[PDB]
Structure 1
Amino acid sequence: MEKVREIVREGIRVGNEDPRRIIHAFKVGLALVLVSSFYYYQNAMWAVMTVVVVFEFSVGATLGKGLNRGVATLVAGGLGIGAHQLARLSGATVEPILLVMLVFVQAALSTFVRFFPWVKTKFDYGILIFILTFALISLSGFRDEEIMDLAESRLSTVVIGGVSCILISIFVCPVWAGQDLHSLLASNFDTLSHFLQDFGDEYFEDYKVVEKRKKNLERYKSVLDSKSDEEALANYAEWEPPHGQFRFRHPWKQYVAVGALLRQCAYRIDALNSYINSDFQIPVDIKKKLETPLRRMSSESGNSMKEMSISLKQMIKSSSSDIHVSNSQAACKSLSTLLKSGILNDVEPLQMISLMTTVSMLIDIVNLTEKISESVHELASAARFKNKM
């Protein structure tokens, strides 16, 4: 009655974090009901098995697992029938031995192929079904024709299950991986912008300091650890048919590269937070001499990252990043001028080490953000995003 309350609030949390989870939870049920009725009213364990194992969250994942299962079952049925014909051809007591030896050799060779990188990222489930169907067809004890009917039945049922799941996955309330990847990048951008604004606010400054530590740390600490997510969403979205704004080739590799550049900014930001959170604290009246330039640079980088998030959600071509970032380079120029003013020769050198480290951090962040903005513009053009602006 106590842990039950625990999982009840867990369930409400995981639910209201995303409602499409509940809608997909109903979609799987719909698929099972339709398949059952179609094979009751007009085997059938294969139809329900494949509708459970195929239907996944996105539409890309569903289409990908569906074509994996289909094509693999087709090719495996082919090679299996060929093998069984030759096996029955040779002899009557050697048939089982040469059959089992073929199963061994083929399973071994394929299991080894499951370790290549290019085949691991895309067709791993494909190879798995290859092995499975090969051993299904080759390792039965029926007659000549029974195997042909078994093969055609397995192929047809796999196709029907896969097609039912794909249709349901597209036409009810589709969850495209493309939109999730775009939105994930936009969320990452947004968290980095929140951190940069709060830093440009709080660097030069009991429950409130901890709440601020929450709002400072966990955003970028979740930015850094999103590599498997973006790589997964890319490998799912590449299967998706053209829908909405996306043309035939929407170069997902390039978006993943943009994610990488994001994490580079996030590395430097981690260094910045680690210097903030230190106890070796430089007196504020020393940092006073540099307030306005550093705050200008931080604020402008934050605004530009923000509008970039906007442009990755709305898919609208912008050019204000040129203005915001050129002004940031000008801020770096004025900062360079302030540096030549002999303004930091009157501070003990350990402060100099700390302050110059932080200043160099922010400089690197501004230059990086210039790089990313250029990438996103040419990404909007090659993808031919709306030039409405």
Structure 2
Amino acid sequence: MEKVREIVREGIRVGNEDPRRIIHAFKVGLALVLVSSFYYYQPFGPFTDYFGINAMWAVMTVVVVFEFSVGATLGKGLNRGVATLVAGGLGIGAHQLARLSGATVEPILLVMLVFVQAALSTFVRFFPWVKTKFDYGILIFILTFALISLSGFRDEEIMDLAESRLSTVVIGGVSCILISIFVCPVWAGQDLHSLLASNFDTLSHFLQDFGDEYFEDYKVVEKRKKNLERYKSVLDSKSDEEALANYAEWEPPHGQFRFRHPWKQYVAVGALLRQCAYRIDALNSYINSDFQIPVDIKKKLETPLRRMSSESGNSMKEMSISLKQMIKSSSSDIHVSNSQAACKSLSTLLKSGILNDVEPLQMISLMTTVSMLIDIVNLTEKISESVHELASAARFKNKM
């Protein structure tokens, strides 16, 4: 009974985290009901249905194809469709060849052919291109060829078997795609934009909180987590962006995403973000570290460091907005220009020999922190140029 409480609480938090999960749970059931009802009531034409398993293969197609996003289901559906078509052609051809062979040398030749093409296809599944894009395609290639060949079906129930398999795959896939596109879409493109916006948000949060924390029982652990996990979720989000990009390259042009949309460049912006997160990780590890300088030595450099940190944080916040709501903004320009001014003023302040009363070890720590903030400022300028150009050249809402 205790596990009932635990599991229903995990269910509650999963549902509250993203309600589109609940609507997708209903969409799967709607697809199953739709296909099954299509095959029960023969709507306009009762197919030949010589085998009696059409409903089986259609329900299995719908269950395996229907994924969360729209690009995911469209990719799986298109892979399954094309692979079934090609493997059906080769299955009919190979079976005609083996029937031309003889009557007893027929299973030997069929088994040899299945062995050859399954070996070649399993080896091709290791290539980088085919793996990143069309791995399910090669899987269904092997599946359908081995279906049409290695199944103990007669020589005249093959032209009908492949045709029925293709028809059923087409119907299940089309049902899946139409429901997933027209009911309550979950586009992978929007999810990528929103993931990048969330990452920008967490980095800006850390930068402001750091600017205020560098110069200062269970609440301590609360603050420590608020510093750690917030950025630590950016470092572990490369596979997620690389997945959403792949899923996004399949979708059709919906509202504000034209035909040719540069997803590779958005993954590049994500990589630049992750570089900023490397540097921020080093900064945090310098916050938590044991060896702590007295406060006044940091207070003598407080002003430029605080200005640099806060300005880069605000610039990342504005990039977050301009990536989420897809509205072309240009305030990051001002927020990065003032950052450059702060870095220059810090250089001129260091030229004054103010650091001639400090132990060399404290000099190591202090100079490391200054160098970190300078690096994050420059990287923020790079990301701002990248996003500004990527939006200007992609026709966002330039109206401001």
CA drift of 1:142 comes to 3.2
Report Cα offsets for 1:262-318 as digits up to 9, x if no partner. 000000000000000011100001111011110000000010000100000111111
Report Cα offsets for 1:225-280 as digits up to 9, x if no partner. 00110000000000000001001011000000000000000000000000000111
3-state SS in 2 of match to 1:39: helix
* Structure 1 position 360 matched with structure 2 position 371: yes
Report Cα offsets for 1:322-347 as digits up to 9, x if no partner. 11111101100000001000000110
CA drift of 1:141 comes to 3.3
Q: Which stretch of the first structure deviates more once superposed, 59-68 or 309-318?
A: 309-318
**Whole-angstrom CA distance in 2 between matches of 1:90 and 1:3:** 62
**Whole-angstrom CA distance in 1 between matches of 2:29 and 2:85:** 27
CA drift of 1:215 comes to 1.1
CA drift of 1:319 comes to 1.5
- Which residue does the alignment assign to 2:47? none
- Which residue does the alignment assign to 1:380? 391
Report Cα offsets for 1:35-62 as digits up to 9, x if no partner. 1111112221000000000000000000
3-state SS in 1 of match to 2:398: coil
CA drift of 1:10 comes to 0.6
**Percent identity between the two aligned chains:** 100
**Whole-angstrom CA distance in 2 between matches of 1:190 and 1:280:** 30
Q: Which stretch of the first structure deviates more once superposed, 164-173 or 378-387?
A: 378-387
CA drift of 1:145 comes to 2.8
CA drift of 1:382 comes to 2.1
Structure 1 segments unaligned to the other structure (5+ residues): none
CA drift of 1:87 comes to 0.8
CA drift of 1:113 comes to 0.3
Q: Which stretch of the first structure deviates more once superposed, 75-84 or 132-141?
A: 132-141
Report Cα offsets for 1:155-189 as digits up to 9, x if no partner. 00000000000000000000000000000000000
3-state SS in 2 of match to 1:241: coil
3-state SS in 2 of match to 1:145: coil
CA drift of 1:143 comes to 3.4
* Structure 1 position 318 matched with structure 2 position 329: yes
**Whole-angstrom CA distance in 2 between matches of 1:200 and 1:55:** 47
- Which residue does the alignment assign to 2:320? 309
- Which residue does the alignment assign to 1:257? 268
**Whole-angstrom CA distance in 2 between matches of 1:11 and 1:140:** 43
Tell me which of 167, 186, 189 is aligned to 1:156.
167
**Whole-angstrom CA distance in 1 between matches of 2:210 and 2:263:** 32
CA drift of 1:14 comes to 0.7
**Whole-angstrom CA distance in 2 between matches of 1:131 and 1:89:** 23
Q: Which stretch of the first structure deviates more once superposed, 317-326 or 370-379?
A: 317-326
Report Cα offsets for 1:99-158 as digits up to 9, x if no partner. 100000000000000000100011100000000000000123333331011011000000
Q: Structure 1's 74 and 346: CA in aligned 2 closer, same or farther, altered over 3 A?
A: same
CA drift of 1:207 comes to 2.6
CA drift of 1:80 comes to 0.6
Q: Which stretch of the first structure deviates more once superposed, 334-343 or 310-319?
A: 310-319
Structure 2 segments unaligned to the other structure (5+ residues): 43-53
Q: Which stretch of the first structure deviates more once superposed, 218-227 or 143-152?
A: 143-152
Tell me which of 87, 97, 106 is aligned to 1:86.
97
CA drift of 1:354 comes to 0.3
3-state SS in 2 of match to 1:146: coil
* Structure 1 position 18 matched with structure 2 position 14: no
**Whole-angstrom CA distance in 1 between matches of 2:219 and 2:154:** 78
3-state SS in 2 of match to 1:279: coil
CA drift of 1:375 comes to 0.2
- Which residue does the alignment assign to 1:117? 128
Report Cα offsets for 1:52-74 as digits up to 9, x if no partner. 00000000000000000000000
Q: Which stretch of the first structure deviates more once superposed, 134-143 or 48-57?
A: 134-143
3-state SS in 1 of match to 2:300: helix
CA drift of 1:208 comes to 2.4
**Whole-angstrom CA distance in 2 between matches of 1:315 and 1:17:** 23
Q: Give the alignment's TM-score, normalised by structure 1.
A: 0.99
**Equivalent residue runs for 1:12-91 within 5 Å:** 12-42=12-42, 43-91=54-102
- Which residue does the alignment assign to 1:273? 284
**Whole-angstrom CA distance in 1 between matches of 2:235 and 2:261:** 25
CA drift of 1:34 comes to 0.9
Count of aligned residue pairs for this structure pair: 389
3-state SS in 2 of match to 1:144: coil
3-state SS in 2 of match to 1:330: helix
Q: Give the alignment's TM-score, normalised by structure 2.
A: 0.96
CA drift of 1:381 comes to 1.8
- Which residue does the alignment assign to 1:345? 356
Report Cα offsets for 1:358-381 as digits up to 9, x if no partner. 000000000000000000011002
